[PDB]
Structures are given as C-alpha cells and as structure tokens.
Design a protein around this ligand. Sequence first.
Ligand code: CLA
Ligand code: CLA
Ligand code: CLA
Ligand code: CLA
Ligand code: CLA
Ligand code: CLA
Ligand code: CLA
Ligand code: CLA
Ligand SMILES: CCCCCCCCCCCCCCCC(=O)OC[C@H](COP(=O)(O)OC[C@@H](O)CO)OC(=O)CCCCCCCCCCCCCCC
Ligand SMILES: CC1=C(/C=C/C(C)=C\C=C\C(C)=C\C=C\C=C(C)\C=C/C=C(C)/C=C/C2=C(C)CCCC2(C)C)C(C)(C)CCC1
Ligand code: SF4
Ligand code: SF4
Ligand code: SF4
Lengths: 38, 138, 743, 136, 31, 27, 97, 73, 80
Amino acid sequence: MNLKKYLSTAPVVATLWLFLTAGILIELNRFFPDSLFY
Amino acid sequence: LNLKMPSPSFLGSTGGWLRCAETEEKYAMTWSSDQQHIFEMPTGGAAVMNSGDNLLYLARKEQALALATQLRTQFKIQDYKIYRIFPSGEVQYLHPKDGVLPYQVNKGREQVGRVKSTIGKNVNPAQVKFTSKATYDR
Amino acid sequence: EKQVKVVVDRDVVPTSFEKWAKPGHFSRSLAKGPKTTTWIWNLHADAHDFDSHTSSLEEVSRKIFSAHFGQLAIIFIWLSGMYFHGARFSNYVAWLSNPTGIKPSAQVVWPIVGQQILNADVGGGMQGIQITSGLFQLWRASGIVNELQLYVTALGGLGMAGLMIFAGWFHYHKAAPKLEWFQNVESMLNHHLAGLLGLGSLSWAGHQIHVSLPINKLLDAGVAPSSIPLPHEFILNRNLMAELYPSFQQGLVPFFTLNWKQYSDILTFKGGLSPVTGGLWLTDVAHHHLAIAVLFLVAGHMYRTNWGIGHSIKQILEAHKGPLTGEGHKGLYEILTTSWHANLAINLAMLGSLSIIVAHHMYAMPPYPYLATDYPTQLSLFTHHMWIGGFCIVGAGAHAAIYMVRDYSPTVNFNNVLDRMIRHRDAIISHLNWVCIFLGMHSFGLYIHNDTMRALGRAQDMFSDTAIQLQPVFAQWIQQIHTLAPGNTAVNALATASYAFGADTVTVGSKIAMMPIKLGTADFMVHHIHAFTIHVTTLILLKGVLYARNSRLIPDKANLGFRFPCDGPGRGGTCQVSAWDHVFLGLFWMYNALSIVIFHFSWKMQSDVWGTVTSNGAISHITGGNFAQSAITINGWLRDFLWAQASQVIQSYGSSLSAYGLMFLGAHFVWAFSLMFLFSGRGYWQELIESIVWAHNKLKVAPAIAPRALSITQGRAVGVAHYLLGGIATTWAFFLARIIAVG
Amino acid sequence: DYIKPYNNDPFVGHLATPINSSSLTRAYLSQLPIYRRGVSPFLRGLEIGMAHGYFLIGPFVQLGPLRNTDIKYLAGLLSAIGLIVILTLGMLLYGAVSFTNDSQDLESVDGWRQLASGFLLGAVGGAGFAYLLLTL
Amino acid sequence: SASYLPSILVPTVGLILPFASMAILFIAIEK
Amino acid sequence: ITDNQVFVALIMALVCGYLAVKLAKQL
Amino acid sequence: FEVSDGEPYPLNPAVIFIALIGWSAVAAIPSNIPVLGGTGLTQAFLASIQRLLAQYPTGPKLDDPFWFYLIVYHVGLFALLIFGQIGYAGYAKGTYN
Amino acid sequence: MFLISWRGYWQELIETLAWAHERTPLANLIRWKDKPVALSIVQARLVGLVHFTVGYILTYAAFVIASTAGKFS
Amino acid sequence: AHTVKIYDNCIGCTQCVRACPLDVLEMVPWDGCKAGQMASAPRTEDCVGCKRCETACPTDFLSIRVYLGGETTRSMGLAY
Ligand code: CLA
Ligand code: CLA
Ligand code: CLA
Ligand code: CLA
Ligand code: CLA
Ligand code: CLA
Ligand code: CLA
Ligand code: CLA
Ligand SMILES: CCCCCCCCCCCCCCCC(=O)OC[C@H](COP(=O)(O)OC[C@@H](O)CO)OC(=O)CCCCCCCCCCCCCCC
Ligand SMILES: CC1=C(/C=C/C(C)=C\C=C\C(C)=C\C=C\C=C(C)\C=C/C=C(C)/C=C/C2=C(C)CCCC2(C)C)C(C)(C)CCC1
Ligand code: SF4
Ligand code: SF4
Ligand code: SF4
C-alpha cells in the first residue's frame, strides 16, 4: 500500500504540476487582467 | 515423388494454386502422421491429415514451408519433405535438402555468401562506380 | 441438463496500492523497466487488452465484468453531471414557460480571459452556451417541471455511480465469479430480454402513464409548470387521473378482464405528431413501451435455464444445416462462449447499427416535445448518433479480425459457415470489389458528368429533373404506400407513422416540424453515393477479417499477430498488410461515408424540411429548394453547401458563436497535423531524434529513457486519430454554428 | 455437399458450385460462339461481332449527345462503328504480342487475326442491321 | 486564317495520335 | 498570317519533327 | 438436372404446383379493407392484372394498386416455393435437415 | 490515396482480382502478359507525391487566376 | 534475386535461420566462434526480402544483410 510512490509517478506529478501552473496563470489573469507590456 | 500418395481430406477452397502453377513451378509437401489431426491449410481453411501418408500441392515455397512450420509446432511431426515440380514433370528436392533441419548445424554444408570482416569495412559506392562490383564485394 | 448456479471466489485479489507504483505490472515485458520511450506508449496500448495479460479465460472474464462496472459508474457520473448542470446552471424553468422562444442552455462560462462573451443571450434571464443535446426536451417529456427534481435526479445518479464503483471493486477483490459463470448465455439472454429490456420498458411505460402523460397533458393545455400537481399527487389522488383520463375510473379491473379496449384514453395509436409540440403523442409512446415490454418479456422465456422448459442455443445452431452449408452453424456456440472478442464484434456491429437506426427514426419522428422546432438539437442528435454508430461498426470489424487472428480454432471451425466462408474468401472479396467499382462509377461518375455538362453549358444533357431524370421510383413508391397505410393497412392507426413519408406538414411556433421529404434525382444520386461508400468501407473491413489469418502474399499472418507493422520490403512490399491496418484504412472510409451521410441530412433538411411558415401557410426554407438543382453537382456541393453555409462559422467572431469559429480553425490544424503522421515514416524521425539526442549529449542533459520515434503501427494510429478528430471537429463546429446562427 | 473442388481434386484455386458448374451452366457456357466445337475463328468472330454491335448501337443512339436531333440514329451508328474499330485495334494488339507463329487454333497470330477480322465484320454488320431496324 | 486546320488537327492529335502512339508503345514494351 | 504562311510553318515543323525523330532514334 | 458437378438434384413440378395452390388459397381469404376491397389479395391481384391488360401498351404507374398486390403476392408465393423445396428435398428426398 | 494507404492492402486486392479474372468464363482467353502487381513502396510515394503536387499547383492556379479575373473584370 | 551476405561478426546463434520463412539460410561448420557454426545463404534464389532474418539477428549491427536487387517471380511472392 505505497500510495505515495504512485502519486509520485510521471502522469500524476505532471498533471498536478501543470494544474498548479495553469491555476497560477488563471488567478494572475483575473486579478491582473489584460496584462500587456508589463 | 510418389505422386499417388494419399492427400489430406480437403473440401476445395478458392485459395489453391491457379493456372500459373500448371505452366510454372508447383510445390508439393509430403509428410507422414499417425493421428488424423486437423490443421489449418495455408490457403485458408481446415483439413484433416489422413493417418499414414499425406501429400498436397501448393503454388509457393513459402506456403509449403509455413505449413511445415505449423505441422512441426502444432504437432510433433518432423518428417516433412517439400519438393518442387516443373511443367516438364521433373521433381526437385527442396526441403530439407539434406535430411537435417536448416538451423541444425550439419557437416558437408559449404558456406555461401560470406564477407570478410564487419560491414563497416565495405567500400564506398564512389570507389566501385562504372564497374560490375558492389560494396559488399571484397 | 446443466445447473445454472452461481459460484464465486472470495478475496481472490487483494486491495492494495502496491501494484499502483509499478506501471506495466500487468505485462511481463513492461514490468522489466522502460529502457526506451516506446515503453510509455506500449503501457497504454496494452492496458485494456486483458487477453494479452493472462492466458486464462476466467481472469479475463473477471477483468471485463469489472471495468464494465467502472464504465457504468463513469456513465452515471456523466448523467449526474448533466442533471446537476440543468438544475444549477440552466434556464430550464424559463424554457418550460416559453419553449419556442427560449434557447436551451446549461453551461455558464467563467469571466477570465474575455471568454464571458460565449454566454449567449439564450433568454430566460441567464446567459450561457446553447446546448444542442436535447436535455431540455428529454426532461420535459419525462415530466420534470422544477429544478428540485433535477437536483434529486443528479444526487441519485451520483449514488448509482458509487454503487457501480463498489460493485466493480467487489466483483474483483471480494467475490469474483468463476468461468462457469459468464458462460451461461441462456440465462444471461433470458434476464437481459425480460429484465434489463422487458422490465425496463415496462417500468418506463408505467412512469409515462403515471407521470409523463398527465404532466405533459396539463402543460399542453396552457397550465403553468408551477401550478401543475406534483407527480406523486396523480398517484395518491386517483380523482385527478380520472379527470384527465376517464379510463382510470375503471382502474386495473379492465386489464385483468381482458377489456383492454377501455384503455383508449391512455393507450392510443394515433400515429402522428402532436400539433401543439410537434412530437409524438405521449399516449402512443406509452402504449409502444407497454407493447415492447410485453413482447420482450415473452421473448425472455425462450432459452432453457435450470429447468426442463426452454431452448438450447447450441441445439438450435446445430439444427440449422443445409446442402450449401455442410455443417451449418455447428461450433458457433463454443465460439461465442470461449472468446469475448467474437461477442464484442457481434455486439459492436449491432450496437452501431442500432445507433444509426436511432438517428434516422429520431429525426423523422421527433419523439420528444419541441424537439423538431429546435433544429440545432435535431441536427446535433442525428449527426451524433450517426457518428457513434459508424465508430461502433468499425470497432465491430476490428474485433472480428482480432478474434480471427487470436481466438480462431480449425477444429471448432470445421466445414461450418465460418470455415466455408474462409475457403471462398477470394470470391467474396473479388465480387465485392467489383460491386464497389460499379457503385463508385455509377454514383460519383454521375456527379462528375453533371459537373462537366454544367461547365460546358450543356445543361440539357444532365442527370436532373429537367434533363435526364433518375427518379427513385421504388423509394417514392414506398413513401406513397406509407402515406396510404393509415387507412388500408393500419386500420387502427389514425395517421401515418412519419409525416416525412407524406400526409400533411406540421408547424409549431411558426416553424416547420415535419413535412414530406420528397425524393428526386439529387436524392437518387446521393443515396447511391451512400451505398457506394458503405460498400467500400465494408469491403475493407471484410477483407481485413477474412485474410486476418493468412493470404496468398503472407501465408502465416496469424503467427505475426493482429497488430504488426509489416513483413518487410519483400514480395514487392508488405506494408499495412495486418488486419489492424485494414481497420486503420476502414476508419478513413467510414469517416468519408459518414461525413457524406451527415452532409446529405444537413443540406436536405435545411433546404426541404427545416424552415419558417408565414401566416396563411406560406413556407420558406433556410435554403429555398436549392438542393434540387445544387446537390446534383460537386460544384454545387462546394458553393451552395460548403461555401454558402460556412459564412456563419467564419463570421462568428465577435459574438457568442466565436468559440465555434475558433474550434473550426483548431480542427483544421489538427486535421492538417494528422497528415504529418500519415505521409511520413519512423525511420526519418528516428534519425532526427538521433541528431537531437547528440545535441543533448553535448550538454550532459540526455535522458536515461532512450528517446525513440513512434512505432510504425503507433504512427499510423496517431495519424488516423488526428485525421478523424480534426475532420469530425470541423464538421461539428460547422454544423453547430450554421444551425445556431440561422434556424 | 453441393460445393466441391472444381476437378474433384482439392488444393485447386476453384470450387464447383451450382452456377459455377452445372448441367445448365455447362451447356450454356458451351455452344457459345467461343468454346463451341467445330467452329473456325472467323465464324466465331463474325457471330460475336454481330451480337456485340447490335447492342452497342443502342446506348449511343438513345443517350448520345445528338439523341434529340434528326440524325440521332446515324450519329449513334457512327459512334458504335468507331468504338468497334477501337475494340478491333485492341484485339489485334493483344494477338500481336500474346501469340506467336503456330497452327491456326485461335491461340496463334493467324487465328486471332481471323477472329479479329470476323469480330469487326460482324460488329459493323450488326450495328448496320440495328440501325436499319430503328429507321424502319 | 485556315479555319479548317484546327478542326483537322485537334481530333488527330487528340484521338489519332494518342491511340496510334499507345498501340506502337504497347507493341514495343510487350515485344 | 495567310493560309500559305501557315502551311509553310507546318512544313518546317514537319522537318523539325523528322530531325527530332532521327536524333532520338540515334540516342 | 445436376445442381453442382456430378451430384444430382431432385426437381419436382409438384412442388411448384402445391406452393402455387397453397399460396393462392391462403391469399384468397376475403378481407374487408380498402386496398383489397373486401376480397382476398389473389382475387384483387388478378383483377388488377385484367385491368392493366386491357390497356396493354400503358403500364401501371407509381400510384397504381397493382404494385402492392404484386409485391405481396410474390413475397408469399416465393416464400412457399423456397420453403416447399426445402421441405421436399430436405425431408421427402432425404437430404436431411 | 497513395500517401495514406501503403503497399500490402493493394497486393492482396490484386491477388483477389487475379483470381477473379482467371476464374471467370468467356474472359479466360485474355491472359495478362505481365503479372499484375501493386505499386511499389517507393513508386507509391512518388505517385502520391505527384498527385498531391499536381493538385496543389492546379488548385492554387485556378484560384488565383479566377479571383484576380472576376475581382477586376 | 536478392543478395544475402553473412559477415564475420556472426555468432552462430541460428536465429536468422530459424526466422527465415523460405529456407534460404542454413548453418554450416565454422571456427570463428565457440558455437562452431556460421549462417549461410545457399538458396538466395528463393529469398523475397522480408528481412525476417535481419530482424532476428542479435549482433550489434546485423551480421546478415539482405540487398534487394533483381526481382523475379519467387522474390515477388506471387502465387498467381
Ligand atoms: C411496471 C409498470 C407499472 C407500475 C409500476 C404501475 C403502478 C401503479 N399503477 Mg399502473 N398501469 C400500467 C403500468 C404500471 N402501473 C399499465 C401498462 C397500465 C395500462 C395502461 C396501467 C394502468 C393503471 C390504472 C388504470 C391504474 C393504475 C394504478 C397504479 C397504482 C396502483 C395499482 C393498484 O394496485 O390499484 C388497484 C386497482 C384495482 C381496481 C384492483 C383490481 C381488482 C379490485 C380489487 C376489484 C374488486 C372491487 C373492489 C370493491 C374495488 C373497486 C374498484 C373500482 C371502483 C375501480 C400503482 C402505483 C391505479 C392508480 O392508483 O391510479 C393512480 C389505477 O387506477 N395503473
Ligand atoms: C412458407 C410456407 C411454408 C412453411 C413456413 C413451411 C414450414 C415447414 N415445413 Mg413445409 N412445405 C411448403 C411450405 C412451407 N413449409 C410447401 C409449399 C410444400 C410443398 C412442396 C412443403 C412441403 C414440406 C415437406 C415434405 C415437409 C415440410 C416440412 C416443414 C417443417 C420443417 C422445417 C422447415 O421446413 O423450415 C421452417 C421451420 C419453421 C419453424 C418456420 C420458421 C419460419 C421463420 C421464423 C419465419 C418465416 C417467414 C416467412 C419467410 C414469411 C413468408 C411470407 C408469408 C406471407 C408466406 C416446417 C415447420 C417437413 C415437416 O413436415 O417437418 C418434419 C417436411 O417433411 N414441408
Ligand atoms: C491550483 C492553483 C491555484 C492558486 C495558486 C490559487 C490561488 C488563490 N485562489 Mg484559487 N482556485 C483554484 C486554484 C488556485 N487558486 C481552483 C482549481 C479553483 C476551483 C476552480 C479555485 C477557486 C477559487 C475561489 C472560489 C477563490 C479562489 C481564491 C484564491 C486566492 C485567495 C487567497 C489564497 O491564498 O488562497 C489560496 C487558494 C488556493 C491555493 C487554491 C485552493 C482552492 C480550494 C480547493 C478552494 C476552492 C473550493 C471550491 C469552491 C469548492 C471545492 C473545490 C474542489 C477542488 C475541492 C488566491 C491567491 C479566492 C479569491 O478570489 O481571492 C479573493 C476565491 O474566492 N480560488
Ligand atoms: C433481470 C436480471 C439482470 C439485469 C436487470 C441485468 C442488467 C445488466 N447486466 Mg447482467 N446478468 C444477469 C442478470 C441481469 N443483468 C445474470 C443472471 C447473469 C449471469 C448469467 C448476468 C451476467 C452479466 C454480465 C457478464 C454482464 C452483465 C451486464 C449487465 C448490464 C449491461 C450494461 C447496460 O446495458 O447498461 C444498463 C444499466 C442499467 C440500466 C442500470 C441498472 C443497474 C441495476 C443495478 C440493475 C442490475 C441488477 C443486477 C443484475 C442484480 C443485482 C444484484 C444484487 C445482489 C444487488 C446491465 C445493468 C454487463 C455489465 O455491464 O457488467 C457490469 C456484463 O458484463 N450481466
Ligand atoms: C465497447 C467498445 C469497445 C471496447 C470494449 C473495445 C476494447 C478493446 N479494443 Mg477496440 N475499438 C472500438 C471499440 C471498443 N474496443 C472502436 C469503436 C474502434 C474503432 C475506432 C476500435 C478499434 C480498435 C483497434 C484498432 C484496436 C482495439 C483494441 C482493443 C483492445 C485493447 C484496447 C487498448 O488497450 O488500447 C488502449 C486505448 C488507448 C491508448 C486510448 C486511445 C485514445 C484514442 C485516440 C481515442 C481518443 C478519443 C478522445 C475523444 C479524443 C479527444 C480528446 C483529446 C483532445 C485528449 C480492447 C479489448 C486493440 C487490440 O485489440 O489490441 C491488439 C486494437 O488494436 N480497438
Ligand atoms: C498542420 C500540419 C503540420 C504541422 C502543424 C506541422 C508541424 C511541424 N512539423 Mg510537419 N509535416 C506535415 C504537416 C505539419 N507539420 C506534413 C503533411 C508533412 C509531410 C509528411 C510534414 C513533414 C515534416 C517533416 C519531415 C518534419 C516536420 C517537422 C515539423 C515541426 C517543425 C518544427 C516546429 O515548427 O515546431 C513547432 C511546433 C509546432 C508548430 C506545433 C504547435 C505546438 C503544439 C500545438 C503545442 C503542444 C500541444 C498543446 C499543449 C495542445 C494539446 C493539448 C493536449 C491535452 C491534447 C513542427 C512541429 C520537422 C521537425 O521535426 O522539426 C524539428 C521535420 O523534420 N514535418
Ligand atoms: C460513370 C458515370 C457516368 C455515366 C453513367 C454516364 C452516362 C452518360 N454519359 Mg457521361 N461522363 C462521365 C461519366 C458518366 N457518364 C464522366 C466522368 C465524364 C467526364 C470525363 C463524362 C462526360 C460525358 C460527355 C462529354 C458526354 C457524356 C454523355 C453520356 C450519355 C451517353 C454516353 C454514351 O453514349 O456512352 C456509351 C455506352 C456504352 C457503349 C455501353 C454502356 C455499358 C452497357 C450499357 C452495360 C451493360 C451491362 C449488362 C447489364 C451486363 C449483363 C449482360 C449479360 C449477362 C448478357 C450517358 C447517359 C454524352 C451526353 O450527351 O450526355 C447525355 C456526352 O456527350 N458523358
Ligand atoms: C482528346 C480528343 C477528343 C476529341 C477530338 C473528342 C471528340 C468527341 N467526343 Mg470525346 N472524350 C475525350 C477526348 C476527345 N473527344 C476524352 C479524353 C474523354 C474521356 C474523359 C472523352 C469522353 C467523351 C464522352 C463520354 C463523349 C465524347 C463525345 C465526343 C464527340 C462529341 C461531339 C458532339 O457533341 O456531337 C456528336 C457526334 C457524333 C455522335 C458523331 C460520332 C463521330 C464518331 C465518334 C467519330 C467517327 C469514328 C469512325 C467511325 C471510326 C474511324 C473511321 C473508320 C471508318 C475506320 C466528339 C466527336 C460524345 C460522343 O458523342 O461520343 C461518340 C460522348 O458521349 N467524349
Ligand atoms: C434470389 C432471391 C433473393 C433476392 C436477393 C436479395 C436477397 C437478400 C439476401 C442476401 C443473400 C442473397 C440470397 C442468395 C443466397 C442464399 O440464400 O442462398 C441459399 C443458401 C442458404 O441455404 P442453405 O441450404 O445453406 O441453408 C442452411 C443454412 O442457411 C442454415 O440456416 O445460402 C448459401 O449457402 C449461399 C450464400 C450466398 C451465395 C452468394 C450470393 C451473394 C450475392 C449477394 C447479393 C445478393 C443480391 C443483392 C440484391 C440484388
Ligand atoms: C442480362 C439479361 C438478359 C439478357 C438477354 C439478351 C442480351 C438477349 C439477346 C440478344 C442479342 C444481344 C442479340 C443480338 C443480335 C443481332 C442479330 C440477331 C443480328 C443480325 C443479322 C444480320 C442482318 C447480319 C448482317 C451482316 C451484314 C450486314 C454483313 C456483315 C456480316 C453480318 C452477318 C453481321 C436476360 C433476359 C437473359 C436475363 C435478364 C437480363
Ligand atoms: S518499413 Fe514501412 S514501408 Fe517499409 S516494409 Fe515496413 S511498413 Fe512497409
Ligand atoms: S530476407 Fe526473409 S526470405 Fe530472405 S533470407 Fe532473410 S528471412 Fe529469409
Ligand atoms: S546472422 Fe545473426 S541470427 Fe544468424 S547466426 Fe549470425 S548472429 Fe545469429
């Protein structure tokens, strides 16, 4: 019953990391919309 | 050889040898068995090999060899002989050609198609241009 | 006599996460480590292939029963999602108040990157994406009037999904049935015929009689949805049902006294569409479900199970034998009880055919209320079921080839129909190929000839109504017979089954619901094109299944397997020789055939059926009679259909339909990206990957998992997947945008 | 049981099915201008041509581009004659490459030449007869 | 002008020349 | 371009064809 | 007659006669329906045949009832003929089920 | 067509056609001098590339000429 | 008429002969490896070029190379 190892596999870790990245991007886009030319 | 040898009980099929086999090469396979086994013909179908002697005709050497492979694998039959018949009628012994399986090393066989060293030593195509020589030729 | 008993193994498989951390554990080769990037693809390619994992039929049967439960749970979750979306983010009540004016919508897009524009002004207060799934019409037909019922249904669906999750885990780790179970085809058929379908239709008929009928009757009588009594009130207070249907005054006594004719208020056979909503009369639908339930229940007592009475499928199969078929259907029973691939092939072909039939019957005889008036929903549903049916048919062929390559046995298939067919497979495929050539010439050549004539100004020499005419006399005759059936062959039927055959037109909300679909020369040519494409795709699939084991080119294709790249550059070339490749080609042909079929339905419906009706009966279609003279030429199919109707999907930018336009472009990209994988080989990509790997090596950043190119078979699969995805998405966006912008 | 190998010898690429081989089928396939015993190549060609041109004229006269004009029959006859000439050309080419010098038995250059001449003459005559029937 | 030259050449180069060339070419390749 | 001029051009074209047939047969 | 190769095939004209008589008698049962006009499909079909024979050059068009009678009569007659030959050869002649 | 389907499906198809031609009466007399065979692997790539190239060029030629003509004529 | 050539790096594993479907290869005595056997191609007239032997060769670089040359009836695998 090694759930940590499974959660550490490539698909799970990749989906979690990309989900966090997309969430950060979206959150930044609603708090700071239509960002251009810094 | 032994053209009167009994044939497996097959019901025809439309995948057998065509007219081309009549005017050209036609392979034959003759094997002996002790049980009336059911085997898949290489032409598509199912046949029952007569207990005793079985002889059938095919239009390709690969078909006969494939049938022999399944007779040797699906069943423990190793006494399969593949001959070739020409339109003239002269038979030719093709498989095994020596009574021993090809993958079983046997004395009396002369090496054919041997190249010294590895392929990395092959000459460039530019060095054998305009000549009847190949890269693999030393 | 065999006892139809249940035997199971307890705690057969332990429940633990130990195997979750070892990808590829199900395969001996995949459990040794990747060593290359091809292992990642092989892990998913052979994940659901339970027959390759183990050689035991019991284990495969258990792995199927479970995972069937998982898919059932997935379907229940999806259904719960649809119901919850309807209850929380949809204008269902507003739509009920004004079904013709309010556009169905159950999706609300978040305002983040300007995507808030997708929230179309569908009406009813809320603004969102218009749904063309027919969820609103289905819910109305089911008697739903308030969103509380939708919420309860969503919760029930979630609970059912949880149950289907527990059942799937329990039937694999707590109680796994043995192979004797799953081989009781007589019992499984009896139960599915009398319990899954018979009792299911019976229960649905009861619900319609007690919920759908009264609620819909009140809705069609001008009563507000909030003022209609609750469904339980119609059951508790019989006075209400009696008032709405006097037949209920007699109660169930007439049923038990065989005085079924007293149920003429609830069990009618009117035959036509309701003039108020445009759909089938709910009474005829309830009576239909009752009859189908009784018929299925009677059919469910045919096979023999644990009792002397019944029938044996094996005995019936072996009994059918004739002079032209030596052993008839002998050995087929053992084939369908020892190989899941054969059963899957038959079931997939039938399920796909059933889906296609469903599409035709649903558009011709709109079953749900206000379904015909909602052209977007009609187009989407016909096209959707048509596509799912075609995909299931191609899958049926693929699984037939799989069974032929792996589960076939010469002893079982001896002198039977299957063996006798494999014997003359050359006659079958050459004659079928000849039929395909004849059909293509006499179908596409007619179109090409018309193009050549119109371009030369020789319109008098065309295959049209004005010029040489090719009238579907047989189909037109069947239509006339259907038109006259309600009085000479259907004595108790009060109207034709479908108004598409004839009779009169039906208009609901100043919109045409269903009018006679007259067939002409254009329909003759298009129908022949459909037959031609169906023949070529079935030829490809049949060829792949018949030669799956061997052929005159490769005498031992079976030993090579069902899914192998090729035998090499020998014998002139043996590329795409395996049956899997035949399925790969059949996918493109099925896509072509289905695309042409949906194109014909869309254009014909928009030019001769769908449209508006002005006061006094004047009819004006979306594309006034242009299909009669424009569908007879390829130029017309490109100008009046692909170019004229695409203006809605290309000009959708700046509005709520912009998304569709975007998807219209994206799909194209995908369809064009597939070409990359279809016109190329892995040798070149492997060399390019070698150079890229050298670049990585120069920086000490090379990966341990040796990068490799996609396999030949994997490359073909990726190419076909992208091709189908892009094409279907392009036609999906085009159809949806065109039908939503206008009509 | 009706389906058997063509020559009762299995392993052949053919089957003796009902319409493939039968009393009626064997009688019909036989006696035709081709395959009939005691018929010279020229006679076979003449019969085949007179039977081919007759039905070949029909399509051109009925659906030809000039099917509505007063010379529909003449135009169709000319088109059929041209098609017959092209077919005869094909026949002669086939005989020129496929067959060699040997006895005239329909499988030689002279035999196929006689067959082609007969086919051309018969086809032209049949087309003319059909045209005459249509005009009358 | 020679308005008859095109009417005599187009059919010759479109029907006579192709058939004759194909026949000679077929004889050459086969023999 | 008179008819005679067209005929002269055709004759020259025939000569060119003959030369191009000889050149090809020689090759 | 030989159906295939040297294997004989039993042909009995009585099969055709019995199939024709049986189907005509079955279809001769009257039915008070507008298409049949209160008579069996056999009588209606024969009546339509006579009507269309009067006008020998002009054939029946798409709206003529003759086509419905023709299809149903041929469907049933062909079914009796096919099933009849199956029963005669399979059971009477010993060809087996 | 040639850019997607590769040799092997066509080889078997041609074998089936060969069987049909040499097993049909009144047409057995006509015998192919050269044994029918499917287009080679490389031959298929060249034929498909030629078809694709001819279509690309002809399609854009017709489009450009017709558009520039109708627009300004 | 494909040319099958065996090189000196052959280890005499016989996998090429076992995987050949046309009996084109065989094993002959040799002294270049402990196996004492080497692959030979004395029936190259029956070769079709399927390259099953090339795929079945374990050496780093294939010790058996099949070159597609003259095409005949046997090499085209024509049963008609
Ligand atoms: C699986 C499908 C299904 C299901 C679950 C149900 C379920 C139900 N139906 Mg129903 N129904 C169905 C299909 C279904 N039906 C179909 C296909 C039909 C034919 C179209 C009907 C027609 C029907 C009618 C007409 C009625 C129901 C009724 C009912 C409800 C009570 C049944 C009852 O026991 O009353 C039993 C009623 C009797 C009359 C018993 C018969 C024998 C009695 C004992 C006679 C002896 C005399 C005695 C003094 C009673 C006098 C009764 C007289 C005044 C009528 C019940 C919830 C009843 C209802 O509750 O209405 C809302 C109702 O009246 N159903
Ligand atoms: C269509 C008419 C018809 C039908 C249904 C049958 C049916 C039957 N015949 Mg029979 N027969 C017929 C005509 C028919 N026969 C005629 C005209 C003759 C005179 C030559 C005979 C002479 C004959 C003999 C000598 C024998 C039989 C026997 C039998 C039985 C053996 C099994 C069998 O034949 O297959 C059919 C079996 C079934 C159970 C029927 C299934 C039907 C399917 C499910 C649907 C059919 C739909 C059909 C195509 C509809 C057509 C349209 C309609 C308007 C007519 C069987 C029940 C044998 C017997 O007596 O039994 C031992 C036998 O000895 N028949
Ligand atoms: C994965 C990256 C990510 C990141 C970095 C953030 C960051 C942030 N989010 Mg956010 N969020 C995310 C994903 C993320 N979110 C997702 C996937 C959803 C669901 C679509 C939400 C929904 C959400 C809402 C409704 C709100 C925020 C808010 C906020 C800000 C509040 C301050 C804070 O520090 O809380 C840190 C928050 C997180 C790190 C994410 C936790 C999200 C949890 C699951 C709460 C959402 C509950 C949801 C309504 C119901 C169940 C969801 C299910 C997944 C369990 C913030 C900086 C609040 C805001 O607007 O600030 C004014 C607010 O109202 N988020
Ligand atoms: C009248 C009894 C009955 C009923 C109603 C069903 C119904 C069903 N069976 Mg089933 N089956 C039965 C008896 C029955 N079976 C028997 C006796 C056998 C042994 C001979 C089998 C062996 C069998 C196999 C091997 C498989 C099925 C499968 C299925 C499902 C098909 C998928 C589908 O169409 O979605 C429709 C789904 C629904 C309409 C939802 C309804 C679900 C509820 C729970 C009704 C099912 C009741 C269940 C059979 C018994 C309850 C047991 C109890 C201890 C809780 C379906 C739910 C397939 C499947 O999907 O696997 C899970 C499949 O693989 N059955
Ligand atoms: C009830 C339907 C059904 C079922 C139960 C099965 C079951 C099975 N199939 Mg089959 N099949 C079906 C329908 C079905 N199929 C249909 C409809 C087709 C035609 C498309 C096929 C064509 C087919 C082929 C050609 C093959 C199988 C194979 C298999 C077996 C292994 C599957 C596997 O492990 O691959 C793993 C599955 C995947 C890696 C997923 C692939 C994803 C594709 C591209 C679909 C993407 C859909 C999605 C909507 C895309 C958009 C979203 C995107 C942007 C992310 C398995 C027993 C294989 C086999 O038998 O093994 C030798 C085999 O080769 N199937
Ligand atoms: C739409 C058609 C299409 C497209 C888009 C491409 C694109 C590409 N080809 Mg190409 N090709 C095509 C058709 C196409 N080809 C055809 C018909 C042929 C003839 C067989 C070729 C033959 C060919 C060869 C021989 C070569 C290429 C190469 C390349 C790459 C060049 C480098 C580059 O620009 O990378 C940039 C990347 C892109 C343009 C792709 C866009 C980025 C994507 C969309 C982002 C990732 C996915 C995204 C997250 C969304 C998906 C999410 C998921 C959940 C579904 C590139 C990816 C060359 C190469 O490999 O380059 C090194 C190479 O040598 N192609
Ligand atoms: C494959 C589809 C197709 C069809 C059905 C037609 C049909 C027709 N075309 Mg057309 N055409 C086509 C494609 C087609 N074309 C294409 C693709 C082009 C562009 C290249 C053209 C360009 C074209 C032109 C320029 C013209 C036509 C014309 C015509 C008409 C007369 C042609 C003629 O005389 O042929 C002759 C036919 C035959 C000699 C024989 C036909 C074969 C026979 C009937 C088959 C019998 C088989 C038999 C049943 C077997 C069993 C018998 C045995 C057992 C005894 C005719 C209706 C002409 C016209 O004016 O239009 C009205 C005309 O000028 N076409
Ligand atoms: C490349 C040059 C070329 C030329 C010059 C022609 C010329 C002609 N074509 Mg053709 N065509 C061509 C290429 C060509 N085609 C190609 C490549 C195709 C395939 C795409 C076609 C497909 C095609 C079709 C389908 C049809 C034509 C038809 C015609 C004729 C139509 C004229 C008309 O409208 O009145 C009609 C004039 C007549 C009916 C009189 C018939 C004149 C005959 C054919 C010429 C004399 C032959 C002669 C008897 C034989 C040699 C002499 C003999 C004594 C030894 C015309 C003579 C139509 C036709 O009428 O077919 C016959 C028609 O049906 N063509
Ligand atoms: C001729 C009257 C039927 C009208 C044609 C359409 C019928 C639809 C059924 C399709 C199969 C054709 C019927 C003959 C077939 C038929 O029923 O024969 C009879 C025979 C069945 O009788 P048996 O004695 O074998 O019965 C024992 C078993 O059937 C046990 O159930 O079937 C065959 O063995 C041959 C199968 C196909 C033979 C090749 C024909 C292929 C052509 C396919 C195209 C058909 C015509 C297309 C429409 C124009
Ligand atoms: C598929 C079909 C069919 C068909 C049939 C037929 C087709 C028949 C016939 C026929 C035919 C198709 C015929 C033809 C003919 C022709 C003729 C009868 C002629 C003649 C004569 C003459 C007058 C001649 C002359 C001449 C001259 C002028 C000189 C030169 C030489 C000659 C001799 C040529 C049937 C019904 C079975 C079945 C169903 C459908
Ligand atoms: S490498 Fe590709 S093209 Fe070559 S034989 Fe294999 S599958 Fe065919
Ligand atoms: S290419 Fe194929 S046939 Fe030729 S030697 Fe190798 S394995 Fe044998
Ligand atoms: S050629 Fe390759 S497979 Fe054959 S014996 Fe030598 S090393 Fe082994």
